[PDB]
Structures are given as structure tokens and as C-alpha cells.
Swiss-Prot record:
The gene is CIAO1. The keyword RNA-binding does not apply. Keywords: Chromosome partition, Cytoplasm, Disease variant, Repeat, WD repeat. A motif (LYR motif) lies at residues 172-174. This is Probable cytosolic iron-sulfur protein assembly protein CIAO1.
Length: 328
């Protein structure tokens, strides 16, 4: 049960590509094909536009991400740059990250606040360090993906980075002896991996794909009771198959409640819950919501509020954002 709380025309006559809540869950950033980033907050009984972020980008803003402190927003653009915006009382464009050869598809901040990752059609993930002066420098280029990189996201607490690619793989990266290495390549999807989400425990990662499945990957540390061989290892422990009629464009795993939402090319939002009597080594999930025509076109993003459990935001190719209350 997913109840509609409100709709806003966030990016009129263009795609709304992505949404991101600030850590406080008080503001929602949206971005899309009109080159603008909009910040949404409640005023009275409605979500309204508090700020419009323009004149940072000359092309589509594909994704946005907030710093763990909530003071900064990053925007990944088809103009091959990522802009950093600082919140002041309004947002100002403070920095432009240049270096990618082609369209930037995603951006994400590490939980330390000291690093961010961007990824690109140029088939790479770049790791950037921010210093005390608010200056940004590329500290590592991660080039092992062989195709267009679609998404980056960091672990909820650790300096562990995940990426998803048109090459059908998910990769994990960490810092080892003063340099960033790919510590896992997760194979199993049969087509493009569009998005990723870590679970509340941080021990698992969900991926979604053009192959119309969600895969659940679990981290196994050396000496695990399950006997997963290590040289941590990641293994697929669940595939949610046969539940999506079209490409799955986005996945969101609620850090508060563990509810797993998906955004699909059939215009529907679905929510799944892990079965609390299932074996955690071979878990099962139940479909708990299936909202047909959630939007009038493809759903590109779902994002759970990090402070209000069950509050879900979604957006669509039709330019709209919707707010929902999930009744479990």
C-alpha cells in the first residue's frame, strides 16, 4: 500500500532524472533534462520549490547527491562536469569538477565527507578528494569497467565504493596501501546494471538491471561461518526475478526500515520486504506494493526519506515528482 501525498511538476516538459534527500530528510533535490536542479521543502500542506540551481551546467543534469553533512550538493551533468553547490541560509555553485572525457552519469559522497566519486560514459569512475580549502583533486581513476558506467554509491559508514555498468557488472573499490583498487567484480546480471543500494546493515548491496531482475549481494569477511572462500568476498544470495515487466531503472533500500523500492519502465513503483522468517543466507522477499501508473511515463528514481520512515519520493520521464506514504 502506497498512498499518494502530492505531485509536483518538477522539471516541466523535460525528464526528471533523479532525486536525493538531504540527510535531515527536510529537503529533496531533483534534477533533469531542463539543466536545472530544484530543491523541494514543505510549506504549509504542500511540497514547494525552495531553491532553483541554474547556471552551473550547460546540459542535462543526470544525478545529484548530498554530502553526509547536508551542506553540499553535487550534480553530475552530460556537459562532462560535476558541480558542487554549498547551502547558505539558498545554494551557490562553488566548484566545478572537470576531467571526464564524456557525459557524467552519477556522483556520490563517501560517509567521511572527504571523498566523492563520479562515473561516466568515458567508462571510468573517478575518486575525488576534497581538502580543507574546499579544493577538489582526482586521487584515483578506476578504469576496469569496460563500458558506460551508470551509477556510483558509497557504503553507509565505510569508505567502500560501488559502481554499476553497461558492462553488466557491479564493482567494489577500497583504498589499499595509498591507492584505490577494485576489490570485487560481481557477475550475474545479463544486461545493463542501472542502479545500486546498500542495505541498513551495510553488509548487503542490491542491484537492478535491464535484465528485469534485482540481485542481492552479501559481503563475506575472511573466517565467515558460511565458508565463503576469501583471498572480503561478495556473493549473490537472492535474485528477484519475474516481478518486473520492463527495465528496472532504480532501486532504493530504506536505511530505516529495510523496505526495498524499485522504479520501472512500466511506469510502476514496487516495494518488497525481506521475509523475517527466511534464512538470511538465502533470503526471500515479498511484494508489498505494486502501484500501476505511479507516473504517466518511466519511473527513473525512487528515494526513501532518511528520517521519516515510509515517506517515498519518485520521479518520471514526464517531469513530475510524487511523494508517497508506504503502508507496510
Amino acid at each position: 500500500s502506497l498512498v499518494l501525498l502530492g505531485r509536483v511538476p518538477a522539471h516541466p516538459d523535460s525528464r526528471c532524472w533523479f532525486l536525493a534527500w538531504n540527510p535531515a530528510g527536510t529537503l529533496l533535490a531533483s534534477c533533469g533534462g531542463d539543466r536545472r536542479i530544484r530543491i523541494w521543502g514543505t510549506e504549509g500542506d504542500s511540497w514547494i520549490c525552495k531553491s532553483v540551481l541554474s547556471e552551473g551546467h550547460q546540459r542535462t543534469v543526470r544525478k545529484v547527491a548530498w554530502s553526509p553533512c547536508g551542506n553540499y550538493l553535487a550534480s553530475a551533468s552530460f556537459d562532462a562536469t560535476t558541480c558542487i553547490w554549498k547551502k547558505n541560509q539558498d545554494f551557490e555553485c562553488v566548484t566545478t569538477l572537470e576531467g571526464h572525457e564524456n557525459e557524467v552519469k552519477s556522483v556520490a559522497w563517501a560517509p567521511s565527507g572527504n571523498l566523492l566519486a563520479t562515473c561516466s560514459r568515458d567508462k571510468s569512475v573517478w575518486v575525488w578528494e576534497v581538502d580543507e580549502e574546499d579544493e577538489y583533486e582526482c586521487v584515483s581513476v578506476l578504469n576496469s569497467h569496460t563500458q558506460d558506467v551508470k551509477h556510483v554509491v558509497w557504503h553507509p559508514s565505510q569508505e567502500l565504493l560501488a559502481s554499476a555498468s553497461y558492462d553488466d557488472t557491479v564493482k567494489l573499490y577500497r583504498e589499499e596501501e595509498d591507492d584505490w583498487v577494485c576489490c570485487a567484480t560481481l557477475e550475474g546480471h545479463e544486461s545493463t546494471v542501472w542502479s545500486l543500494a546498500f542495505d541498513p546493515s551495510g553488509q548487503r548491496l542490491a542491484s537492478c538491471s535491464d535484465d528485469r531482475t534485482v540481485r542481492i549481494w552479501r559481503q563475506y569477511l575472511p573466517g565467515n561461518e558460511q565458508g565463503v572462500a576469501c583471498s572480503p568476498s561478495w556473493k549473490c544470495i537472492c535474485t528477484l526475478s519475474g516481478f518486473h515487466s520492463r527495465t528496472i531503472y532504480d532501486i532504493a533500500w530504506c536505511q530505516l526500515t529495510g523496505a526495498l523500492a524499485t522504479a520501472c519502465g512500466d511506469d510502476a513503483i514496487r516495494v518488497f520486504q525481506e521475509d523475517p522468517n527466511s534464512d538470511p543466507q538465502q533470503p526471500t522477499f515479498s511484494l508489498t506494493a505494486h502501484l500501476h501508473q505511479a507516473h504517466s511515463q518511466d519511473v527513473n528514481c525512487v528515494a526513501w526519506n532518511p528520517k521519516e520512515p515510509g515517506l517515498l519520493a519518485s520521479c518520471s520521464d514526464d517531469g513530475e515528482v510524487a511523494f508517497w506514504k508506504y503502508q507496510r
